[PDB]
Design a protein around this ligand. Sequence first.
Ligand SMILES: NC(=O)c1ccc[n+]([C@@H]2O[C@H](COP(=O)([O-])OP(=O)(O)OC[C@H]3O[C@@H](n4cnc5c(N)ncnc54)[C@H](OP(=O)(O)O)[C@@H]3O)[C@@H](O)[C@H]2O)c1
Ligand SMILES: CCc1nc(N)nc(N)c1C#CCc1cc(-c2ccc(C(=O)O)cc2)ccc1OC
Length: 157
Amino acid sequence: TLSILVAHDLQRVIGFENQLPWHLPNDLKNVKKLSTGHTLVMGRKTFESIGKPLPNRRNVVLTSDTSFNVEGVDVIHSIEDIYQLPGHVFIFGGQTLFEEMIDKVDDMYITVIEGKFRGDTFFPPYTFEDWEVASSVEGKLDEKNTIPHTFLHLIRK
Ligand SMILES: NC(=O)c1ccc[n+]([C@@H]2O[C@H](COP(=O)([O-])OP(=O)(O)OC[C@H]3O[C@@H](n4cnc5c(N)ncnc54)[C@H](OP(=O)(O)O)[C@@H]3O)[C@@H](O)[C@H]2O)c1
Ligand SMILES: CCc1nc(N)nc(N)c1C#CCc1cc(-c2ccc(C(=O)O)cc2)ccc1OC
């Protein structure tokens, strides 16, 4: 299975100055639940913004840099390389990779952040006419999670 995994706001913002614009532990927990034991594929800028591979899953970084060789990270140099990765593969970001892969993936796990943030990077436009809502779950608001958010699982029609 090839999936997108993304959190975006009401205007599809996903980032600002190499960081996530919001702070939502519930979503981090969901990312961990979905991707532990599987594979994350991310562009070079997303990886660098994270800074280190995420524990307990395969980390794959897409880059043109032939010198890239980070411990605990597998490197690929082409989009076509993604299709040779075994198991459940999640396209993890950022804008460039989402743009390159949204027409190719089987399904999408999208956390919709119900707010409008300042952003400089965006998820590409998509239409529910192309995507079935397999599930939609409202996130719980509390002390640590204070922006409304909804977990979607969308499957390509
Ligand atoms: N909210 C979310 O769910 C979410 C998730 C992830 C990231 N983000 C945000 O997204 C932003 C970063 O996105 P971005 O678009 O700037 O960067 P990016 O997609 O993370 O990285 C782009 C880089 O990936 C490499 N790359 C992409 N396509 C390639 C290809 N076909 N062949 C070889 N290399 C390729 C290139 O690396 P080289 O230049 O080294 O060749 C390119 O410069 C950040 O703000 C981050 O916070 C948000
Ligand atoms: C966790 C945010 C997020 N949610 C969803 N649903 N899909 C995504 N693709 C990303 C993402 C991303 C990139 C990113 C992840 C993280 C991050 C932080 C913590 C954990 C974790 O606790 O496991 C995982 C990723 C940090 C910074 C960062 O870019 C700045």
